[PDB]
Amino acid sequence: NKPNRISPELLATCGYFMPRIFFLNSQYAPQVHWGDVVAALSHFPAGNLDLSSEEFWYEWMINWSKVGDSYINIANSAKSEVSHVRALRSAAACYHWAEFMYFSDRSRKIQLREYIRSCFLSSIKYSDLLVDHQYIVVDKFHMPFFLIFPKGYKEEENHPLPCVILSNGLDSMTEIEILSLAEFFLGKNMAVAIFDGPGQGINLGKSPIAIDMELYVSSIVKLLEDDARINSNLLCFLGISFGGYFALRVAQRIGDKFCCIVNLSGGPEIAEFDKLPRRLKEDFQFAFMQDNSHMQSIFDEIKLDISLPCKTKVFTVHGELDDIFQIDKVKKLDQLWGDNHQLLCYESEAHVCLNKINEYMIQVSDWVSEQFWLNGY
Amino acid sequence: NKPNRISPELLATCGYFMPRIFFLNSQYAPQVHWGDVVAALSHFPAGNLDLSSEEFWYEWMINWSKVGDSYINIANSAKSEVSHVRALRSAAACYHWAEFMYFSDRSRKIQLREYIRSCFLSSIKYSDLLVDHQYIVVDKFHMPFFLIFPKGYKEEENHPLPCVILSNGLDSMTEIEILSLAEFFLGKNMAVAIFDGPGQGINLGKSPIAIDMELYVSSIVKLLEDDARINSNLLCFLGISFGGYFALRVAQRIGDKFCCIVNLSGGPEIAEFDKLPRRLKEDFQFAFMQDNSHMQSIFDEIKLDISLPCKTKVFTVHGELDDIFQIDKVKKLDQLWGDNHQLLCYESEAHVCLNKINEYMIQVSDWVSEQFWLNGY
Ligand SMILES: Oc1cccc2ccccc12
Ligand SMILES: Oc1cccc2ccccc12
């Protein structure tokens, strides 16, 4: 027999998603090893290389679920707490990539996201970071909220810390990609706030995604204001992908509540829904819980009034070849918003510039620190 | 223009090395992101896909050096210590993969390994782990030695800790792959000992690799014996690749000095030198500092006398399709060494079973803990 390997065709086919799957080298956030991708794709059915097809992402979910199951078996039979957590993290990462682009079975997708959240809540007891977990009541909506503090934090010894609020994209999971981003701010002795708004994290497939997410961010700001451990005059809001769109909304509506805002490849409007690749349509359809015919109408409502003033400092990281949020619309916003907006545009980079994420998160993390220092920190 | 990507041909060509390049998801040890591989291989010259060729690994070194240089620029212009260290780690990882399979310019290879060691020694001041760095004098040889302690270690509060000694392979760097392995033992509140024997780490290309490495391990055991912080009755020796061969030697000569020994894909003898792929010959040639004609004679001297008794518990992880250390020779040793030896053989896995490294290091780390517990810990 030959050594277990990913077929040349399939490996080349998934080139767009490989940067997404590996994402950031994290300390706490679940992350796959190369071997996990091999375990998933080594026995992937032949003649199935269409990313637009529903058949491809079914087999993707099936095969990634198998690797997830294997790590849960290791976790259950683990002889130490450290080994148990390592296995649970690997399982959580595998289950996320199984579901993140799977929208065919609503019940199965919710189940996989419930697995990940169960693993996350259970891991908190073994964590060496203080995690204040509670529900924020916004009207009738009970929003899952997590306030995480830096390593070796003591309330008595330390002064009120700055806090960074981070928002999910359309297909991200809170304790995976967003916790991965959050570690760059925890590393700089900042508190971090991660949340599941309507249609976000565990709520994806249950409640429709709220276009007016700033309403839910306002409720987080109110909590941080009342929290003595948090310096409410030193707040940042970060958004990634569709989360970046919410960042631009926050900058317009409640921007004066923040020292700075980070937009990771969000835009003032999305490209033509019909012309989107076939999986992004289903992605958007599932997040908003609407059919094909209704989506272009929602995209029209989403389109921002760029005229409305920017109430704080905004830093945007965007790729030239972004096929979701078109660069021309972002450069239009950059010119109009003027000195309040900073644009880091990457040549020959796709949506979220994932080939540059390590270097641009170093720059982004330093930029946020500078904005707090400029506000007398 | 198209998005920056690794060519399907080159990505398929490097399938054997991708598990090696990404290795383990580490906290401290330098590690590449997917984007770093893209930055290295995106502009790799076309019609250059021969892994046996000297031209391929020159361009490999050139292109990986470029990514290393980029991270050093980020490190120098970094606005924080945390950002500086993140960049230095990325640079160190990039420079290692530039040199690890490059043997054409001895001066350039030593320079790249000197860059990595300089970055490592400079990072120690920013480390939250206690790193006792000194030289162990073995005859006339000044051996670089690093004794690292677990997170939040206090000598006064804590009792004498167990310590794991880890050995380099032929083409590994101490603060990259071996520190990555070491983190599994630091996570279990064990001290770790990593060293540069003759022809190992910074000494590769300077001094020939010592076949009798147990002589240098004996000097480490003597230091750990004299060290009050280390429980010398609770010692383990781990070796990876050719380091695994040293582990089998240690088990025979000074095995009674260790509770247990871990052999990660070492063997009692190497396959026919002439029949090795063309880059492993140059690899072995460079490590031993000998020409093609002399190597098969050294391989004959290397071959262990399996008859000699095993003086401690040994755990071997090996792949069925290992083309360096043949499985039949390891299974021969397993049968003869009997109850003292445990074999974890992976079906359809190559040398070091890199597609399984996460799961087998979880099992290995738990096995070592169990052997210490059996010796009254
Ligand atoms: O929706 C997202 C959230 C976080 C990261 C992403 C990267 C690529 C594409 C989409 C993403
Ligand atoms: O020599 C080595 C040291 C550490 C890890 C390795 C993995 C594969 C092949 C060789 C290796």
Numbering used by the authors:
A (entry chain A), B (entry chain A): 5 to 381
How is this structure described in the published paper?
A common step during their assembly is polyketide trimming, which Afyg1p, Wdyg1p, and PlAntI catalyze. In summary, the N‐ and C‐domains in all three enzymes are oriented in a back‐to‐back fashion forming an interface that encloses the intramolecular binding cavity next to the active site. The catalytic triad is formed exclusively by the α/β‐hydrolase domain with the nucleophilic serine located in the consensus GXSXG esterase motif. The resulting Ser‐His‐Asp network is perfectly aligned with distances in the range of 2.5–2.8 Å between the active‐site residues.
A key enzyme involved in AQ biosynthesis is PlAntI, which catalyzes the hydrolysis of the bicyclic‐intermediate‐loaded acyl carrier protein, polyketide trimming, and assembly of the aromatic AQ scaffold. Since the natural substrate of PlAntI – a highly reactive, ACP‐bound modified octaketide is not accessible, we focused our study on a stable surrogate. Upon ligand binding, no major structural rearrangements are observed in PlAntI, and the catalytic triad remains perfectly aligned (rmsd = 0.4 Å over 374 Cα‐atoms). The planar naphthalene ring is cation‐pi‐stacked with Arg24 (distance 3.5 Å), while the hydroxyl group of the ligand is in proximity to the catalytic nucleophile (Ser245OHγ, 3.4 Å) and interacts with the GLDS loop motif of Gly173‐Ser176. Thus, the specificity pocket in PlAntI consists of the GLDS β‐turn, with Asp175OHδ (3.0 Å) and Leu174NH (3.5 Å) forming interactions with 1‐OH.
